[PDB]
Amino acid sequence: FGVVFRASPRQSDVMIVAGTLTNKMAPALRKVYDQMPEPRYVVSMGSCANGGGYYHYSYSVVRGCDRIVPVDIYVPGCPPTAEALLYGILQLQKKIKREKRLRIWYRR
Amino acid sequence: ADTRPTVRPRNDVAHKQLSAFGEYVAEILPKYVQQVQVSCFNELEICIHPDGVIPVLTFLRDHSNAQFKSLADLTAVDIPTRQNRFEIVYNLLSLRFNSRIRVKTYTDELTPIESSVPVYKAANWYEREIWDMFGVFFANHPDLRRILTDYGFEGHPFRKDFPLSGYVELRYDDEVKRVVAEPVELAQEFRKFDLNSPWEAFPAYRQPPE
Amino acid sequence: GVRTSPTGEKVTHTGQVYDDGDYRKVRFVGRQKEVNENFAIDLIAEQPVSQVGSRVISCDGGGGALGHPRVYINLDKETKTGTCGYCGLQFRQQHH
Amino acid sequence: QLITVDEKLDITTITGVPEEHIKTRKARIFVPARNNMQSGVNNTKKWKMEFDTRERWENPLMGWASTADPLSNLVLTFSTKEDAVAFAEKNGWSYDVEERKVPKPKSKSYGANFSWNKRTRVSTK
């Protein structure tokens, strides 16, 4: 689809959060997010990242990564199947297709 | 070995051998051993006074009839009703004799425990885990510091009185441009269930009336 | 059985609707309030009553092990039909 | 070899709890009352410690029950009444102790149901 296997943080276009975000790890994830050049999108993969999942009531777990970074697509599952993640990425492509940055700029 | 398809068979030769070795250890280290018990599923435990850790662990490692060369695990259990609320458990493995043994001791919030790193280098990280989660201090430990919890984390989560969700939660604040900790507020409180049945299940474990 | 409130919001089968002055109905502005349109109460009324010829009748909801647990229903009372606790099907005793 | 320490044992400073939930919390020590819907008595054997109930409100989105109290679901089990008090003091909680209520032994007789001159005679079985 044109989605490279491995991308560096500072050439990346989309961040995929695949697992539990603990409180110890949250500062590092926001650091990486800020270093990403725009346009930047976040994909939240699985219950843990979506809202805490099965450690939602833990003392050491962020209850969803949307508390740290803005999320564009939420992929449910524990884990989502590889096909379910692929559906999520293809949903991000359609979300990008509908952007109207220039069209808004013209009417400003 | 009986024709009871659903019931775990008893190995009685293992029970006899483990009971013989429980006496042997009690006879040799009477200064420290406080109790010896072998369970029904064949697992020997030696209870010791907290001061006999190094002598007891050393004897089991080096003796020509022990040779428990491997520390399989090291953990603490919190029982708040006991005066010494913390019970420190050592699971050891002997490859020469293909046997396992458990060594248990106890402490409180303000009593240090001798580090076993001099005996088993495996205990270095195990004791850091015990300190972090249970707040049990080990004396003479090469490098005691948190290993699991976040930096600046107040409290010891694996104590029975530490709340499940803790006291503080993290989010990102736009105004201060960093991740901020704040008092925890749950949109849905964890729902506590009372599941214990009011009828006794196991008479063999009935405790004598007050 | 989907009737609307005076404001314009559809009522759910549980009977819930946002009153006139509740701000929480803003969440539907530009979007929609999802309401299942097949009301279980109205569908189970339509089912005909089952005339039978014994005092006790057993219902399992159909399908054997794909239904609900099997329940035996008493039909001695004449003033009313006998209803299944699980599936809501009604029974009556025939000419008796 | 050893030292002599005599002060009342207190650990509030090193436990890690915030001050708000040490000082303003009222622990309750009691044996649970038997659930009258059942006759079993196996849940009235041990002493429990619990804290005062605090506010719960409806989540604006889904109507769930939201709490800001971090001790709401905390329950501790003790063998004896002293242990519960001993634990509560060293953690510096204000507590109240409720004495165990033991069922009073009773005189039961089957023959009493068929009595020549007493009102205990039963009119039915």
Added chain:
Amino acid sequence: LVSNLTLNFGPQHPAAHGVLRLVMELSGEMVRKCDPHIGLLHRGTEKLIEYKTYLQALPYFDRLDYVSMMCNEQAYSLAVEKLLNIRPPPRAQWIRVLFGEITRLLNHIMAVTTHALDIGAMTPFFWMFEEREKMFEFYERVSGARMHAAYVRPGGVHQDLPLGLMDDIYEFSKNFSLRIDELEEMLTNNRIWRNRTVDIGIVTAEDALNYGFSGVMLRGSGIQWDLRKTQPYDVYDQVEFDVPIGSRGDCYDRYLCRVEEMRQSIRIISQCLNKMPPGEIKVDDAKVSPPKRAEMKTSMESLIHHFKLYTEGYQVPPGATYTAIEAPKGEFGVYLVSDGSSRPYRCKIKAPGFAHLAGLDKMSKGHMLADVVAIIGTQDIVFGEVDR
């Protein structure tokens, strides 16, 4: 201390093991001190298990070593069964060995291929995950989930093998030795690979035992120890296989041991398929195992036991056990304490990766920085179980 390089794998690469913050002191190219910091995937799993019944706690064990899902389940089930004093039926013991060896293959493909991927050899990774993808189908057909099966439960297994599964497993196993051979045609005799693994991270036998190592980490140094052979637990006493033993204790022998374990797993899987016996799949004792959905909708006693099993749960007699299995990564053990109720009082998880990673500093001494990548890989570290 020429310089301290705080190496955070925070911006993670395609390894998926987790995230490791590594703090090192590099006196030039050499490494003088290594200090792993491992709190990043700590989720409070052991405390959460105290608020769940024994059945509710089982899925937590899928999510420890999340490349050994059904082996972690078996350890929990063997521990609980031991406290319950019950026995799973013979058919389930064969299914649990069969899927225990399908899980060992799953783990070693990840272990060897991601180890090689970090050292630049990307291609075998893709070759073998086409095979793991076919193994993920066996998981999904018996449990409905590709990864976290929740299939091995105390008393046996949740459901029976669907008709036609054993044929598909045999077809997979028939073509699989060739897949391993292709992998060795790219790594076993490759001088570049050998230069990156031979005489790297050497561990002596004496230091291995004292540091708590298990699994390949012992057998690479020549220690003849395998729990499946010395303390067998299901039907492993009824299957013939050989234990691979190393001679030099380096990465290359540990790489060879894992590749030979994959061959012995296929050997074992062959025997399980032929010896699979008939019968029931869970212990026929409804105060522990739920009854069949047909019986629960017909029988009063079955409905009562169904109702209580899925609400209160079965009560476990008071006691404490330490149960360990030969997990693919090493000795995986749980110290489980029962207070007599239906919820565990304490569940301590013994992760083999916890000790191995603590032994990293010992192994990294006197090696270049690029070797540390090879040392961590040969340990087979997943931070789900390191942290719990």
Added chain:
Amino acid sequence: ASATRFIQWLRNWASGRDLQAKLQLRYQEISKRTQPPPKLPVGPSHKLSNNYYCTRDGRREAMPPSIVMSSQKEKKAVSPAPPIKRWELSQDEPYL
């Protein structure tokens, strides 16, 4: 499977294996996706008589640990178990 003979010869030669015998992909040697319904067996406790739970209750046959020595309450030396036996080299492939 649909490779021409020439390309089949090439990839066989390059790898040194007869790849067509053990193809990585699956075609029609796989099980049918629809299978006949099963008829699973019952366990050993599905008996209508001589099947009293008190004679097959594993949980109630456990007992509290024995206490070999306790503080309140010419013998030969013993190892915790007989010394483990030396393993024997495989006679299937002793040297890899």
Added chain:
Amino acid sequence: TYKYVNLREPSMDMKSVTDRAAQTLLWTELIRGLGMTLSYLFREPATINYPFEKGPLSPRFRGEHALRRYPSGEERCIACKLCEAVCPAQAITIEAEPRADGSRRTTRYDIDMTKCIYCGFCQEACPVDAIVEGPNFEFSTETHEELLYNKEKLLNNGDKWEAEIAANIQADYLYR
């Protein structure tokens, strides 16, 4: 029973020494590694053409949740709360009351799909096959709020997917 993975002794005849010298200088094994990669270039790729082609699943697959009905149309759920009690993630929240016709029916049934671990314990525990995990695995959303299912959503999923769900139950209910 054990085997030695690497305990060979290399032969020290000239013919063998020359074999290793030829290997070292002529890069023989490295060429062999190039051969294997060349063979794969002419093997057929395992890729499938998603979304036009889909990966194989089974009847037991655990996907999106739905609430079912009886053939008559009455809801199967009787609000026993066995699913709420078993749920390992506490993802289910139930309230009930007597319906206008005296029936035992829920007024709130919610699944926090971001709490759920998709374990399928709730369908194992349901006595009336009211809650099931469907075959849908393609329901990712753009906002978190779209993944908090109330009763209407799960009833709509049951109406949407009943045709497939019933067939999957038919295929597996005998194993269950």
Added chain:
Amino acid sequence: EDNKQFFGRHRWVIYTTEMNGKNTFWDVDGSMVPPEWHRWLHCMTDDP
């Protein structure tokens, strides 16, 4: 379907160019398969 392909490619769908009043000549997604065919397309069954 073409049963001489390998397992996973032997069945496929060509999505309609319009569905529920939305132009899907280019924009198609896996949620356009109705439940009756969803079972066949994912090989959960063997019968269309």
Added chain:
Amino acid sequence: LLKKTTGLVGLAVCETPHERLKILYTKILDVLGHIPKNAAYRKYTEQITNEKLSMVKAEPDVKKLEERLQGGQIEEVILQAENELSLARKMIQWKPWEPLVEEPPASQWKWPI
């Protein structure tokens, strides 16, 4: 004949196993002489130590000696003797034979609570 490899990494071969052991066992017997005759450790460690030492004298062949001792390779037996020796020297300092240092509180080892 002499083993090229012990089989264990970091454990080199012993050229003179019989003599090396005899020195270690004799040292162990000598060290035990400093422990009170009543203490249980002295009685048991002497018994095993003597029984092994008697075999060492009796058996000249290295392979046959290992099969009698059943302690693995003969280098492993030497490594174990060195551990027993160092253990005895540490026991003389610890003095485990003395009566119990202290008894646990009333309900210290009571499970369930």
Added chain:
Amino acid sequence: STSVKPIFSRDMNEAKRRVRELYRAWYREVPNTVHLFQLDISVKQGRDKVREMFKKNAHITDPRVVDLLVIKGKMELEETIKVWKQRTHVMRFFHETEAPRPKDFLSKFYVGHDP
């Protein structure tokens, strides 16, 4: 009994010594921390916070409780000196997002039922 094994101090005089030392290390550190971590507080605000943390534990008189308080304070220092913490951890001491919480009866009465 009152015979208890000691952590480090055998009486409050030794304990107060280690307390005094640990305050020296923190007092020197704040100037460095405010720079390495690029904090927005002044070194005065930082040193007041160290004074505040030490003051809250004034009443303590048990020698063992003081040892642990010092042990924990040194571990906190070791994290800040070695820069294992991050800018977020260091600034958590200042609670700069939590809004003012009243402490007079009427104020608590208006807002909620909390005592």
Added chain:
Amino acid sequence: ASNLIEVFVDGQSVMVEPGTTVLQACEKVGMQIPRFCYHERLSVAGNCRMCLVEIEKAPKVVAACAMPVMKGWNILTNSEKTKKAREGVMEFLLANHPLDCPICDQGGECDLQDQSMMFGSDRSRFLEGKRAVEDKNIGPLVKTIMTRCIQCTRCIRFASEIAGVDDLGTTGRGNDMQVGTYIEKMFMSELSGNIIDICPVGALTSKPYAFTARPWETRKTESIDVMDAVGSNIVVSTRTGEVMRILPRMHEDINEEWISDKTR
């Protein structure tokens, strides 16, 4: 005193006042004998037969609830004979019992469920059809689902001896024996709601509380009634910050274990 005689309970000597039953003798060594018809605040019935227990050297089992102990009896509360008596009696109780646990408010706090798990068998051998009983309307407070009734006659004894009302009794005979009022009557009394608590099964349930909650999800708050000056001790059941029901709390000197219907 010299009144006390000595009995053994599994070999454990206990001294009991003469006239104490076997069931009470077992309670002193901390055991609870299973029961359905016995209630300590009602007259002994002895009809459910779940309390049957073995006396050593005694060929027959005795109803522990209604059997005075005699000097030098060893009560075997866990012998094979005692266990099999319990399994047999539980089988008979569950033979005609409806499969209602999912729809029964008593589910999760049911003595029939819990004692079936602890003392009964794990499976059924009953291969016939079951009994079905019509429901009686005894008022707006107690809901009657009499197919679940196990005929322990507790409600009858409570109304007769505690409430002083003789509306409830058993009409019929044999397997057809039914509990009710025979005529269309409402058992309306200030203490009427108490028969809900003593009924061990879902035969009598609270109409206001029907279907709303399950026992395991409710938090118990011990409090006091304020609807009168007696100060009855109650339990306030709450779930997610909502008051679900009021239950009695045992206080021997105040309300024993009853409450009024205004309290309830």
